[PDB]
Amino acid sequence: MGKIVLIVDDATNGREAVEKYKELKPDIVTMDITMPEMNGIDAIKEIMKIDPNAKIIVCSAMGQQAMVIEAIKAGAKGFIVNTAAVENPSLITQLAQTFGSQAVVVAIDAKRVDGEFMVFTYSGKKNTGILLRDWVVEVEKRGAGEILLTSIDRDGTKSGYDTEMIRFVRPLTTLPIIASGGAGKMEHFLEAFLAGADAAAAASVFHFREIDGRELKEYLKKHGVNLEHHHHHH
Numbered sequence: 001m002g003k004i005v006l007i008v009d010d011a012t013n014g015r016e017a018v019e020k021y022k023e024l025k026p027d028i029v030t031m032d033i034t035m036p037e038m039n040g041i042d043a044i045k046e047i048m049k050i051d052p053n054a055k056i057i058v059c060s061a062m063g064q065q066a067m068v069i070e071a072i073k074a075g076a077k078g079f080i081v082n083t084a085a086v087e088n089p090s091l092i093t094q095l096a097q098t099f100g101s102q103a104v105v106v107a108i109d110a111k112r113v114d115g116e117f118m119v120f121t122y123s124g125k126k127n128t129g130i131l132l133r134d135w136v137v138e139v140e141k142r143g144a145g146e147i148l149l150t151s152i153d154r155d156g157t158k159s160g161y162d163t164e165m166i167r168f169v170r171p172l173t174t175l176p177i178i179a180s181g182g183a184g185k186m187e188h189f190l191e192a193f194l195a196g197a198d199a200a201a202a203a204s205v206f207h208f209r210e211i212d213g214r215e216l217k218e219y220l221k222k223h224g225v226n227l228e229h230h231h232h233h234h
Contacts (some may be wrong), residue, residue, distance in 0.1 A: 001160075001197075001198065001199075001220075001225045001227075002220050002225050002226045002227050003026075003027040003028060003198070003199035003200070003227070004024070004026040004027055004028070004170060004181075004199070004200065004202075004208065004213075004216070004217075005026060005027070005028040005029070005030060005178060005199050005200065005202070006020060006021065006024065006026045006028075006029050006030070006032045006201070006202075006203060007030050007180070007201050007202070007203035008020075008029070008030070008032065008043070008203065009032050009036075009203070010034065010035035010038050011031045012122055012186070012207070013038065013111035014031075014036075014039045014042055014046070014129070015043070015046075016039055016041065017029075017031065017045055018025065018046040018047065018050070018145075020052075020206060020207070021046075021047055021050055021051070022050055022111065023213060024206060024213035025051070025213070026054075027054070027055060027199070028054075028057065028058065028178075028199060028201075029047055029054060029055070029056055029057065030042055030054045030056070030057045030058075030080070030201070031044060031056070031057070031058060031059070032059045033058055033059060033060060033061075033067060033071060034059060034060065034061035034064075036209070040058070040071075041058075041070055041071060041074045044056055044058065044071065044074035044075060044076055045074055045075070047075075047198040048074070048087065050073040050215050052075070055077055055078070055085070055171050056075055056076045056077060056079070057076065057078040057079065057080060057105060058071035058073070058074075058076045058080070059077055059079070059080045060076075060080070060081075062081075062083065062084040063084075065130030066156060067080055069225060072099075075078035077080070077103060078102070078103050078104070078145060078146070079095075079103065079104070079105065080105045080107050080148070081095075081104070081105070081106060081107065082106075082107040082108075082109070082122035083122055084122065085106050085107075085139075086108075086119065086121055086128060086130065087121075089138055089139075089142055091159060092104055092106060092139065092142040092143065092144055093142045093143055095144030095182045096144070096145070097143070098144065100145070101143035101144065101145050102144045102145035102146075103179075104143070104144055104146075105144070105145055105147070105148060105200030106139045106142075106144040106145045106147055106148070107147075107150060108132065108136070108144075108147065108148065108149065108188055109121070109123065109124035109150040109152050110132050110149070110150065110151065110152065110155060110165060111127075111151070111152045111153050112165075114166075115126065116131060116132075117131065117132030117133065117165065118123070118131065119131070119132055119135050119195055120152060124150070124152035124155075130149060132165075132168075132169070133172060134206075136169055136172040136173050137172055137173075139173070139175075140172075140173045140174065140175060144175060145175070146175050146177075146178065147169070147173055147175050147176070147177055147178070148178045148180060149165060149177050149178065149179050149180065149197070150170050150180045150181055151161075151165050151168060151180070151181040153181075154181040154182035155180070155181035156181075156204075157181075157182050158182065158185075158188075158204070158205070158210075159182060159184060159188070160177075160182050160187075160188045160191055160192075161179050161182040161188055161189075161191060161192035161195065161197070162181055162182055162186070162194040163192065163194075165181055166192060166196055166197050167195050167196055169196075170195075170196035171192050171219045176198040176199065177196065177198050177199075178197070178201055179192045179195070179197035179199070179201065179231075180198045180201040183200060183201070183202035183204075183205055184210065184211075185204060185205070185210070186211060186215070186216055187209060188218050189202075189216065189219075189220075190219070190223070193225065
């Protein structure tokens with residue numbers, strides 16, 4: 001509702017992402033480290049210095065346990081899994097028990113196929129056959145901290161978030177839902193929140209100067225949408 005999430009993939013330099021955090025100033029930042037060449041953990045240190053109270057999330061490659069450890073040392077609070085967690089749900093349960101359920105994020109890239117919601121793995125390239133309904137229920141029971149609802153059909157459209165998928169997922173989970181895909185203008189953000197999303201992620205709209213970060217924050221304020229906190233300005 002009132003949280004902004006920035007997505008920095010391996011294709012963007014860590015220095016660039018840090019500069020964006022200064023101007024935009026989001027609440028949550030997701031950075032990819034599966035390609036060490038980009039100095040992912042180095043950027044994580046930069047985010048902490050600018051705002052040590054930020055929620056940093058790190059995406060690790062399947063099988064890099066020590067990589068997850070380093071990301072935590074950098075000040076990360078949460079870490080993400082996708083195809084690995086789906087193939088072996090036991091990993092999600094173990095991760096919650098060890099570092100706290102709130103630190104494990106289960107990401108699901110989904111599409112509408114055969115008249116039912118179906119999960120896709122491998123960056124949404126290949127269908128698994130697992131139903132979106134059944135997977136979401138399992139993720140909650142496993143102790144997943146949060147769930148990332150990604151719409152592959154809407155990704156890159158920039159014509160509004162997949163409000164259909166958002167509403168459909170909401171009744172099956174009591175976790176925070178991070179909606180990703182379709183974000184092109186301020187109107188799309190407001191729609192996604194009404195659909196029951198807890199936070200909205202956007203990367204393209206910022207890098208290409210499509211939406212103004214500061215004006216976006218003002219928009220949410222005007223509608224009376226904010227988290228339970230105390231405001232003090234002079």
